[PDB]
Amino acid sequence: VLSPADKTNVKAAWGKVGAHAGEYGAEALERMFLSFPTTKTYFPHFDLSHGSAQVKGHGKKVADALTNAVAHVDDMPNALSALSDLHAHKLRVDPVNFKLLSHCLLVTLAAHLPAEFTPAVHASLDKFLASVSTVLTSKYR
Amino acid sequence: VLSPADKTNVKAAWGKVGAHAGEYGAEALERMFLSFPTTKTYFPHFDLSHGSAQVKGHGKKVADALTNAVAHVDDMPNALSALSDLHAHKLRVDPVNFKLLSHCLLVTLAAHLPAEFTPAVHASLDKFLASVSTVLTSKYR
Amino acid sequence: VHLTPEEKSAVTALWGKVNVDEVGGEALGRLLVVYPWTQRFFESFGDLSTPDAVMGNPKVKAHGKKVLGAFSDGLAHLDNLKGTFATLSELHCDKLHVDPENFRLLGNVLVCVLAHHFGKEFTPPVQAAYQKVVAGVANALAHKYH
Amino acid sequence: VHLTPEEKSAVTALWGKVNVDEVGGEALGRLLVVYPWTQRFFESFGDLSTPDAVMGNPKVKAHGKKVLGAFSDGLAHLDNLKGTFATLSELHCDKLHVDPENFRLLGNVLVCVLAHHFGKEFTPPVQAAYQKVVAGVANALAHKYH
Numbered sequence: 001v002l003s004p005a006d007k008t009n010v011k012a013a014w015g016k017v018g019a020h021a022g023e024y025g026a027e028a029l030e031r032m033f034l035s036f037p038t039t040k041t042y043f044p045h046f047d048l049s050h051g052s053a054q055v056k057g058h059g060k061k062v063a064d065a066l067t068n069a070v071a072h073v074d075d076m077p078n079a080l081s082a083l084s085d086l087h088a089h090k091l092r093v094d095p096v097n098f099k100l101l102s103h104c105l106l107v108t109l110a111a112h113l114p115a116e117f118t119p120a121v122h123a124s125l126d127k128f129l130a131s132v133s134t135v136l137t138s139k140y141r
Numbered sequence: 142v143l144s145p146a147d148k149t150n151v152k153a154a155w156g157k158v159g160a161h162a163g164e165y166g167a168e169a170l171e172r173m174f175l176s177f178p179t180t181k182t183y184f185p186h187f188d189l190s191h192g193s194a195q196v197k198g199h200g201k202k203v204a205d206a207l208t209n210a211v212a213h214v215d216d217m218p219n220a221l222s223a224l225s226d227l228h229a230h231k232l233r234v235d236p237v238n239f240k241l242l243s244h245c246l247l248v249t250l251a252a253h254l255p256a257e258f259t260p261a262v263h264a265s266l267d268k269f270l271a272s273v274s275t276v277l278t279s280k281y282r
Numbered sequence: 283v284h285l286t287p288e289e290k291s292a293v294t295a296l297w298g299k300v301n302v303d304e305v306g307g308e309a310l311g312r313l314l315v316v317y318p319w320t321q322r323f324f325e326s327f328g329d330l331s332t333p334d335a336v337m338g339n340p341k342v343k344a345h346g347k348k349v350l351g352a353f354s355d356g357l358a359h360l361d362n363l364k365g366t367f368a369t370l371s372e373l374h375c376d377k378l379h380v381d382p383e384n385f386r387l388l389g390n391v392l393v394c395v396l397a398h399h400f401g402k403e404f405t406p407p408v409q410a411a412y413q414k415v416v417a418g419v420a421n422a423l424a425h426k427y428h
Numbered sequence: 429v430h431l432t433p434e435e436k437s438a439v440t441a442l443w444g445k446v447n448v449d450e451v452g453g454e455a456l457g458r459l460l461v462v463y464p465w466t467q468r469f470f471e472s473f474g475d476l477s478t479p480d481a482v483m484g485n486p487k488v489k490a491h492g493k494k495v496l497g498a499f500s501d502g503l504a505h506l507d508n509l510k511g512t513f514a515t516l517s518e519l520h521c522d523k524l525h526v527d528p529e530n531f532r533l534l535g536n537v538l539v540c541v542l543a544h545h546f547g548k549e550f551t552p553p554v555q556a557a558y559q560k561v562v563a564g565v566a567n568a569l570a571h572k573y574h
C-alpha cells in the first residue's frame with residue numbers, strides 16, 4: 001500500500017540514517033523495553049540494561065533487516081521470508097508487539113532526524129513499518 | 142493467507158448459516174454494542190434499542206457483504222472494493238473496531254452452530270474475518 | 283470488576299453449569315489451535331501438530347483444568363481480582379515470561395467456548411458481563427508485570 | 429498514575445520547555461496527516477487535503493492549542509486524572525461521539541512530536557515516563573463512555 005511518494009520518503013529518510021542504523025535499532029529496542037515492559041518477556045536470556053552488547057547486537061540485526069526491506073521495498077515478502085518463518089514458527093512473538101517496536105523506531109528516528117522527519121515522511125515511515133510488520137506476521141497461522 | 146482448507150471450512154459453516162445470515166448479523170451488532178460500548182460512537186444516528194429496524198437492516202447488509210466475501214474468497218479485494226472505499230473515505234471507522242465486530246460475529250456463530258463450530262472451523266472463521274477486516278481497511282491511508 | 287448485581291448473578295448462575303475440567307481443556311486447546319503462536323510455552327507437552335492432537339493431548343487438558351480452576355476460584359472474588367491474582371501475575375512475568383496479550387486471547391476464546399456450550403442461553407447481556415470479567419482477569423494477571 | 433520521583437521529575441522538567449501553542453498544533457496536525465481517518469471529526473475545519481494544508485490550517489492550530497492546554501492542566505493532577513477529565517470524558521462521548529482509540533493515537537503522535545522537538549534530550553527513560561502519562565490521560569478521557 002506504499003505509494004511512489006511513500007517509497008521515495010522512506011528511501012530518503014533511511015539513507016540519512018545510513019551507517020547509524022545499528023545504533024538507532026539498539027536505541028529503539030531500549031525505548032521499547034522501558035516504555036512497554038511486557039515486550040521484555042521475549043528476551044529473558046538477554047541482559048537488558050542500558051549499554052548491553054546483547055541489545056546492541058540485536059539492534060544491529062533488526063536495523064540491517066529494515067535496510068534490506070527498504071532495498072527490497074517492492075518485494076518485501078520474499079526478501080523477509082526467512083524472518084517471517086522465524087518469527088511465526090520459532091520465536092512466536094505475539095503480533096501486537098510489532099506495533100510497539102514500530103512506534104519506538106519512529107520515536108528514535110524523530111529524535112535523530114530533526115530536518116527529515118516532516119509530517120509526510122512520518123506518515124510514510126509509519127505505513128512502511130506497518131507493512132514490514134504485516135509481512136513478518138503473515139505466516140503465523 | 143486463507144488456506145484451501147480454510148476456504149472449505151468457511152464455505153461449509155456459512156452455508157449452514159444460510160437464510161439466517163441477516164438475523165445473525167443483527168445479533169452480532171447487538172452483542173458488539175453491549176460488550177464494547179465505544180463502538181456505539183459510530184452509530185449516534187441509529188436507534189440502538191433491541192430489535193430496532195435500523196439494526197436489523199444494518200445486520201442484513203453486513204451479512205450480505207460477508208456472503209459476497211465467502212462466494213468470492215479467492216478475490217476479496219475486488220469483491221469488497223466498494224465497501225473498502227466507503228469505510229476508508231466516508232465512514233472512517235478506526236481499524237481496532239473491526240476486531241471487536243469479528244469477535245462478536247464468532248460468538249454469534251458459536252451460539253447458533255453447535256455441530257459445526259469445531260476447533261478447526263473456529264480457526265478458519267477467525268482467519269476469514271481478519272482477512273475481511275484487512276480488506277476493508279486496506280485503503281485507509 | 284464493577285459488575286452490577288444482576289451482572290454478577292448472571293455470571294455466577296451460568297458458571298454453576300460449567301464442567302470446569304471440560305471447558306478448561308476445550309478453551310486451552312482452542313487457544314493453541316486458533317492462535318498457534320501460544321504453543322511456544324508448551325513444547326514439553328508433546329504432540330501439538332494437528333487440531334485433533336492438541337485437543338486430545340492429556341497435558342493440554344491438564345493445564346486447561348489448572349488454568350480454569352484458578353479462574354473459577356477468582357469468580358468468588360470479583361471485588362478483589364488484583365489481590366487474588368497478584369502472586370500469579372508475578373509468577374507469569376518473572377518466571378514464566380508469558381506476554382499478557384495471551385491472557386486477552388484466552389479470554390476471548392473462553393467467551394467463544396461458553397457461547398458454543400450454552401447456545402441461546404449465552405445472551406448478549408450475559409456475554410457483556412463475561413467480557414467485563416475476562417478483561418478484569420487479564421488486567422489483574424498483567425498488573426505486576428515490570 | 430504512579431510515576432517514580434525520577435519519572436515525575438522528568439515529565440515536569442520537559443513540559444516547562446513546551447510551548448503548548450506550537451506543540452499542540454504540531455501534534456493535532458500530525459494526527460490528521462498520519463491517521464487520516466481521524467479527520468472525520470473535523471469536517472468544518474476546512475482544507476485538510478495535503479499535509480501542507482493540514483499543518484498550516486489555523487483551525488487545526490487553534491484546536492491543537494486547546495487540546496494541549498487541557499492536557500497541560502492534567503499534568504498538574506497526575507494522581508487523579510480520572511476526576512480531572514471526567515467532564516471532558518462525558519463531553520467526548522455524549523456530544524462529540526469520539527471513539528477513544530483516537531486518544532491513544534494522539535498520545536503516540538505527541539510522543540513523536542516531543543522526540544522531534546527535543547532530540548537527544550528525550551531519552552528512553554523520559555519517553556517511558558511520557559508513555560505512562562499519555563496512556564493515563566487516554567484512559568481518563570475514556571472512563572465515562574457508556
Ligand code: HEM
Pocket residue numbers: 039042043058061062065066083086087091093097098099101132133136
Ligand atoms: C521491525 C520488526 C522486527 C524486525 C525487522 C525483526 C528482526 C529480527 C532479526 C533480524 C532477528 C535475528 C534473526 C537471527 O538470529 O538471524 C530477530 C530475532 C528475534 N526477534 Fe525479531 N524483529 C522484529 C520485531 C520483533 C519484536 C516486535 C519482538 C518481540 C518484542 C521480536 C523478538 C525477537 C526475538 C526474541 C529474537 C531472537 C533474539 C536472539 O535470541 O538472539 N522481534 N528479529
Ligand code: HEM
Pocket residue numbers: 180183184199202203206207224227228232234238239240242243273274277
Ligand atoms: C466484517 C466487517 C464489516 C462489514 C462486512 C461491514 C459492512 C458494511 C456495509 C455493507 C455497509 C452498508 C454500506 C451501504 O449501505 O452503502 C456498512 C456501513 C456502515 N458500517 Fe461497516 N462493516 C464492517 C465493520 C464495521 C465496523 C467495525 C463499524 C463500527 C464499529 C462499522 C460502521 C459502519 C457504519 C457506521 C455504517 C453506515 C451505517 C449507516 O448509516 O447506515 N462497520 N458496513
Ligand code: HEM
Pocket residue numbers: 320323324345348349350352353370373374378380384385388419423
Ligand atoms: C485466565 C488466565 C490464566 C490463569 C488463571 C492462569 C493460572 C495458572 C496457574 C494456577 C498456574 C500454575 C502456577 C503454580 O504452579 O504455582 C499456571 C501456570 C502456567 N501458566 Fe498460566 N494462567 C492463565 C493463562 C495462561 C496463558 C494464556 C498461558 C500461555 C499461553 C499460560 C501459561 C502458563 C505456563 C507455561 C504455566 C507453567 C505450567 C507448568 O509448569 O506446567 N497461562 N497458570
Ligand code: HEM
Pocket residue numbers: 466469470491494495496498499516520524526530531534565569
Ligand atoms: C488528550 C486528549 C484530548 C484532550 C485533553 C481534549 C480536550 C478537548 C477540549 C478542551 C475541547 C474544547 C471543548 C470546547 O472549547 O467545547 C475539545 C473538543 C473537541 N475534541 Fe477533544 N481532546 C482530546 C483529544 C481529542 C481527539 C484525539 C479528538 C479526535 C480525533 C478530539 C476531538 C474533539 C472535537 C471534535 C472537539 C470539538 C471541536 C469543535 O468544537 O468543532 N479530541 N477537546
